[PDB]
Symmetry: D2
């Protein structure tokens, strides 16, 4: 039995850094995820049962854990317009609860986060965050579903943990997670078909046709509407997830810094691909503000290759 | 604070509802363990098989259900004045992803035929939180599982599904197998809608029917699994999926019909695992589907 | 089969038992948070909380018109029911700061009354596990709180206290304040028995008596110079425990040897000395004083 | 700010040049085992009654598995194992000596029990031998216990005071709730099994008679008596309220009952670090003792420093 704390300490002592600040960032993250998971599980009872808003609570929990780490200098959070700078080194960028529109339904939602190391000559500015995707040291998400899962990369493949609620421990259940190169599942909001251009529309028409590499069967469709849950299914089963540009969202909806970046990092480390609508590698992009958006297609390498060929 | 046992005594069979809520708490805990069921010992089955076992054991031990239909037993179960028909875990293909799944059940007083002859229906939706949604015959009530206390607590009393909401829930990978009436209605929902600020419907499809329908109850909208060339009688089982959801849906102020627009509660199954197509949800959006056919 | 407490109480007012078991689960969870109740918020006093939890559940039951609570001086009557409840919501208050076993104790009446008149009695013992021990009139049953499911499951059906067992449970710090009869009895249990007794005294009466139920032995809190009428409250501590003990096959008397359940409180907070436990060991005590 | 055990340990260890993470991994193994044991003990009879669709043996197994999985505990002493346990596939950094569930005789009653553990650093260049544990108590590097009662508590020393943590079951995290715990020097509570009065010599018997007499030191009140019968629970109360705990030699237990290596030693280290004292019946410092075998027993008196000073005065006069 391998728990996340031992997994992390063992990884970090490869670098003579078992007690370094990175271990405290991970400790802060896993504490925040267990707290958010429990709070999300209580659902309406949060406001209803006393001692004798849910996305706001998630934000507060995450900010508090990060500050109490003592070593995160800088934090971007989706509901804070401005860069958060703490009094007393890593930068964390996060959507504490993504999929908020699913909360009232009690379906799956999640937390998503990228981690940067402060630039050498830095006391904590937007320069430590407005960077190329390739400078992330780590990325992770917690998927709050019928079970809670933590999926992480430190630059060396992907590992998945399940939360043991009897013990409050993340236990390694999917080591060296690999996304299958081929799987006929696609995940997109076809309600936005009206607003897509012809290239995007015709690709989505293609996946509904019989597929030779799928026994002449068309793709199957799934769309929870919580990006973390859809992409988690994509990691485990294979397939495609997309949120393209459209007339109402000319640059997508995923936030580049703390949603498209971390998911692209995880996806590449699992053997998948992640690109924007133009076929550019997501990790090659650089945000201009902390809340830039990007379109995204990510998932099974074979299926992304099909999208890339279509764009031609 | 109204807990479910209090709700059930005040509304007074009570044993049958007790056995059901017990099974749901047990199944919900097991599902939250996910892979840890086979990895972590005290110091190798499948979740769907365990869920069936938990549910059948609870039913059998109630002492009061003589006859049982479960999605995964081919044959009728005989063990007492009541019968229950159940899918103990629906959305099995979502279990490995840890997304929302659920249990669905219809209850008959004593043997398992016309849909209007259910005395009660309910589901448990195992998502990021666990919910129980229940009808006794007079409206719908929704409960949230408090794991601190191990009690379902009334949180959505007199639940009413909004009459209008532009959300549709369907597997559009099956487009190739739909007839033109179905295909064109789905084409229609993607057009601008005057009743949605000139915007198309938004699409959602978890792929676990109980989760998608639970969202439909709380948000409004449309859920469909129509007939198609590979599933000519649909996918949902009439006896223990379509019937109970239809009964819940009508008691909440919505509609539930098959692909021909026949009311689901009017149907009668010829064998315990009969399938049926279904369109259910907001009354106004189902009226749009009815006008379309 | 797994038998839950709801199944048990319907297979056998039901609303009263359900309000009680709800309160017990809520108090158990709260006590398990201990200091965290005051240090951890939604984003990052215990005896008072337990009282409020119990009173709120009793009021919300609808069925309870009148309640006696150890932490309420005056009788309390609600607006809307045919039953009275008398309770110590957390007994063993002085052990809370140590995190050790404590308990809730309650008696139920239909409609200041004889102990024969209680309809039912129960306690919840919050220890390293949480237990509920109950009687309605025909023997006693013990349940364990399964925290995975939030259900009391029957674990001790038809509980029977062994008639003899050499364990005694008493605060010998009060030896200075006892009369000669009590002093010499306690001196006797330390002599070899055809080995002497073993001593155990958690200091939470519910825990000490729960152990006595399961292993056998004697629990006592006699009159002393500082507490001439004992310390246990007759109405909601001595009564319910005596009811359960007799229904389990044991005995419960006061220092004068009189049956606890024959007594009648004259005020809701009256106190009584008590000796309860294995019938053989209580017999030995009776011989000693009588 | 909420302080969790892992942050507390990591912030402590990163002060040290030579912290490799191995000690943090020992604490992680222990806190994992404590949470698992606490959950198992809360199940009680249900472990044998409720399946998928005895406790002290389970506790021992949980503990051995966690210590082995740490990767860095080379040597393990456990009460229930007759022999010294070696994990040859682990690095030779630490030895752990523990009673995984002490107070077993109380488990059937559902009252408080606990885990007690001492931690030693292996001797330089040791492969892992019984020389690594058969040592003077003053050589422990750390000591802790987990008290499983109506709440679960972890009490710990790393050699500079004592800190107490409460287990948050919603999170599965030990949270710092009693920083820099100090046991009162004076407090009129005594914890002893007076059922054993027959088997004590006259010096012990007369001391226990003294504590039942009026103390001018307590406004002419006697001591109050408490004795759960689980040593970890009674000693935990002693830490938090003050008082005395004792299990002396008696004719049936000529060397007492606590095990020196993994019970008297760690409790004595915690007691001294909280400001109390811990001696045997003869008044010898518990931590000055050396076990001759891993399961040696010792008499013990421990608690508030002023109450132990009274016991020491008594045995000095009685000579
Ligand atoms: Mg968000
Ligand atoms: Mg977001
Ligand atoms: Mg199924
Ligand atoms: Mg099904
Ligand atoms: Mg009280
Ligand atoms: Mg009391
Ligand atoms: Mg032991
Ligand atoms: Mg021991």
């Amino acid at each position: 039995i391998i728990t996340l704390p031992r997994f992390i300490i063992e990884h970090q002592k490869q670098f003579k850094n078992a007690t370094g600040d990175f271990t405290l960032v991970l400790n802060a993250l896993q504490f925040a995820f267990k707290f958010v998971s429990h709070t999300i599980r209580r659902a309406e009872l949060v406001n209803l049962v006393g001692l004798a808003k849910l996305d706001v609570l998630g934000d507060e929990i995450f900010i508090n854990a990060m500050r109490a780490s003592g070593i995160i200098k800088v934090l971007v959070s989706e509901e804070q317009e401005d860069l958060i700078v703490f009094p007393t080194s890593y930068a964390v960028c996060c959507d504490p609860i993504d999929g908020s529109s699913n909360l009232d339904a009690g379906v799956s939602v999640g937390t998503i986060a990228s981690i940067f190391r402060l630039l050498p000559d830095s006391s904590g500015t937007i320069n430590d965050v407005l960077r190329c995707g390739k400078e992330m040291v780590a990325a992770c998400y917690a998927m709050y579903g019928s079970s809670t899962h933590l999926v992480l990369t430190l630059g060396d493949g992907v590992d998945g943990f399940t939360l043991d609620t009897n013990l409050g421990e993340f236990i390694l259940t999917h080591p060296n997670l690999r996304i299958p190169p081929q799987k006929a599942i696609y995940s997109i909001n076809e309600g936005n078909t009206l607003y897509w251009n012809e290239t995007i529309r015709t690709f989505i028409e293609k996946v509904k046709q019989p597929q030779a590499d799928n026994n002449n069967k068309p793709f199957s469709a799934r769309y929870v509407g919580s990006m973390v849950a859809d992409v988690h299914r994509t990691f485990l089963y294979g397939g495609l997830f997309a949120y393209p540009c459209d007339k109402k969202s000319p640059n997508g909806k995923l936030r580049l810094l703390y949603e498209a970046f971390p998911m692209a990092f995880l996806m590449e480390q699992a053997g998948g691909k992640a690109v924007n609508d133009r076929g550019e590698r997501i990790l090659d992009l650089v945000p201009s503000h902390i809340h830039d958006k990007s379109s995204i297609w990510l998932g099974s390498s074979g299926e992304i290759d099909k999208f890339l060929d279509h764009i031609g």
